Structures are given as C-alpha cells and as structure tokens.
Amino acid sequence: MENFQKVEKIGEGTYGVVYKARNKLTGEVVALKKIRLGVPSTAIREISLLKELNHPNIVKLLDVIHTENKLYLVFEFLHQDLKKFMDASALTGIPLPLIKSYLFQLLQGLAFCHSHRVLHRDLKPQNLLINTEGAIKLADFGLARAFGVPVRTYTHEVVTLWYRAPEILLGCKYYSTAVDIWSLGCIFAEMVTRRALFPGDSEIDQLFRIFRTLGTPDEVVWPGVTSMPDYKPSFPKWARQDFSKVVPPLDEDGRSLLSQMLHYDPNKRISAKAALAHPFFQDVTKPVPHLRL
Numbered sequence: 001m002e003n004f005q006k007v008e009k010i011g012e013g014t015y016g017v018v019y020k021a022r023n024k025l026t027g028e029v030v031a032l033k034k035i036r037l038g039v040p041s042t043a044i045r046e047i048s049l050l051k052e053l054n055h056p057n058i059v060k061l062l063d064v065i066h067t068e069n070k071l072y073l074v075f076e077f078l079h080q081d082l083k084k085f086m087d088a089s090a091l092t093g094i095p096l097p098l099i100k101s102y103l104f105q106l107l108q109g110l111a112f113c114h115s116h117r118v119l120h121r122d123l124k125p126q127n128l129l130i131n132t133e134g135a136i137k138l139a140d141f142g143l144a145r146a147f148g149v150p151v152r153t154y155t156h157e158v159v160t161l162w163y164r165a166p167e168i169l170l171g172c173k174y175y176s177t178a179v180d181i182w183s184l185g186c187i188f189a190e191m192v193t194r195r196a197l198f199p200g201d202s203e204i205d206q207l208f209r210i211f212r213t214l215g216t217p218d219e220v221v222w223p224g225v226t227s228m229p230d231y232k233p234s235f236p237k238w239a240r241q242d243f244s245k246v247v248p249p250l251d252e253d254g255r256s257l258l259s260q261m262l263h264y265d266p267n268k269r270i271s272a273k274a275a276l277a278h279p280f281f282q283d284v285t286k287p288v289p290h291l292r293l
C-alpha cells in the first residue's frame with residue numbers, strides 16, 4: 001500500500017480483491033491482492049514461507065506487506081487466466097499440443113510444491129495464469145492452508161466444488177498432495193472436452209456426479225472408504241463409465257494418464273513426479289497460444 005497505484009481490478013479470489021497495480025517506485029506492474037482481515041500470526045508466518053517457494057510454474061510472490069487489519073500480497077502479473085483462455089478458445093478448443101504443454105508445466109509446478117510438502121488444495125482454471133510465451137503458472141499456492149477455504153468468498157460468490165477430490169468431500173481431514181492431482185485431472189478433462197467434468201452445485205451433487213462417472217466407490221476400489229466421516233451406506237451404487245465416453249477424443253495415453261490422476265484411492269492416484277514420466281508426454285512441445293490481449 002501507498003507504494004502502489006491501482007490500475008484495475010482483475011480478480012476477486014476467495015480471500016479478497018486482486019488489482020493490477022503499478023509500483024510507484026520500481027516501475028513494476030504487479031497483481032496486488034488485498035486480503036480482508038489484526039492479522040493472525042500463523043497465517044503471517046505461513047505466507048512468508050511462500051516467499052521462498054519459487055518455480056517458473058508458480059506465480060511469483062514478490063512481497064508480503066502487513067500493515068493494519070491489512071495483508072497485501074504482491075504477485076507477478078500475468079495477462080490472463082485459463083478460464084478466460086478456455087472461454088475465448090471455445091469454438092475450436094485449445095489445440096492438444098498446447099493442452100499437453102500446459103498439463104506438463106502444471107505437473108512440474110506441482111512436483112516442485114509437493115516435494116516441499118506444500119499443497120495447493122484449491123486448483124481451478126481461474127487460478128492458472130498464462131502468458132504470451134506459452135507458460136502457465138499456478139496462483140494462490142499455499143493460501144488455503146494459511147487461511148482456510150471458505151464456502152463463500154468475501155464477495156459471497158460461491159466457492160466452486162467442481163475440482164474437489166472425493167476424500168475432501170467424504171470428510172477426510174488430513175488429505176494429501178493427491179488432492180491437487182485430482183483437481184488437475186478435472187482441469188485436463190475440461191480442456192479436452194470444453195466442458196467441466198464434474199460441475200457440482202452442492203457437496204452431495206459434486207460427489208454424486210463423480211460417482212455417476214467413475215462408479216460409486218467401494219472397499220474394492222478404495223480400501224477404507226466406507227469408514228470415512230461423510231460416507232453413507234445409503235449412497236446410490238452407480239456403475240463406472242468408460243473414459244472413452246468421458247474424454248473423446250483424447251488418445252489412449254491421455255486416457256491412461258487421466259484415469260491414474262482420477263483414482264479414487266489417494267494412495268493409488270498418480271503423483272506429479274510419476275505423471276511427468278508418463279508416455280503421454282513423450283512428444284510434448286511448448287507451443288505459443290494465440291492470445292488476444
């Protein structure tokens with residue numbers, strides 16, 4: 001604050017408004033997130049850890065400014081998010097090579113964060129940001145654990161459930177890096193089909209949409225599921241569909257990979273590091289998007 005000229009709003013994440021801003025010294029143009037709330041010290045301490053978790057696929061946290069009831073996070077500015085790009089690209093879709101490049105890069109971002117035991121917990125197309133040179137980067141990494149995840153944002157807009165892993169929906173309190181692999185799998189499926197995979201509009205709806213596509217989980221596919229807090233014996237028991245029906249026209253390597261990322265059992269679900277070795281990525285390249293900013 002003080003030091004920043006606000007130039008436009010670009011965002012209203014769960015925790016507060018994001019503005020494009022110019023630093024009145026450095027020249028530099030940044031995204032300034034003004035987080036509403038003085039400030040609880042554990043979150044300060046947590047957020048500050050984030051200043052060292054740097055990777056070319058993680059949106060750089062430039063500075064943390066704590067002043068009153070006032071927490072501003074100053075990030076690297078990128079000029080659009082994947083949801084806007086997807087919307088823009090709807091008539092033809094994102095070309096597969098670009099989809100592949102984006103998935104590859106996000107997995108790298110995740111492998112990095114995961115290797116330092118940092119989870120995102122709330123990946124969604126809105127927090128995947130892209131630039132003109134064919135990069136894509138994860139934003140808001142680590143903010144969920146620092147703060148919480150609320151059911152509504154500061155604006156009352158509802159927090160999307162569409163990318164939530166089933167172990168979170170079933171009440172697992174101590175979930176793992178696997179939850180980000182689930183989310184990125186849903187996002188990969190959405191890029192390919194141009195439709196969200198599981199667009200739930202409540203927690204039961206989200207879970208039943210998952211069950212309807214992947215089969216109601218049981219003790220066979222997921223040891224320990226029926227003991228989870230929010231598991232009920234009364235869930236309907238739906239059959240698994242083929243992936244071939246779910247993500248046409250993804251090829252067999254794509255489908256193989258997606259299936260591994262969407263394993264019910266978080267223990268069996270593919271890691272980011274293992275995903276990077278999958279044959280899907282054998283012919284990966286780094287195309288430039290056509291970007292109309």
Ligand SMILES: Nc1n[nH]c(N)c1/N=N\c1ccc(O)cc1
Nearest residue numbers: 010031075076077078079139140
């Ligand atoms: N549109 C954008 N360009 N660059 C950004 N960083 C950006 N938007 N949003 C965010 C959102 C959250 C964040 O932690 C960082 C940036």
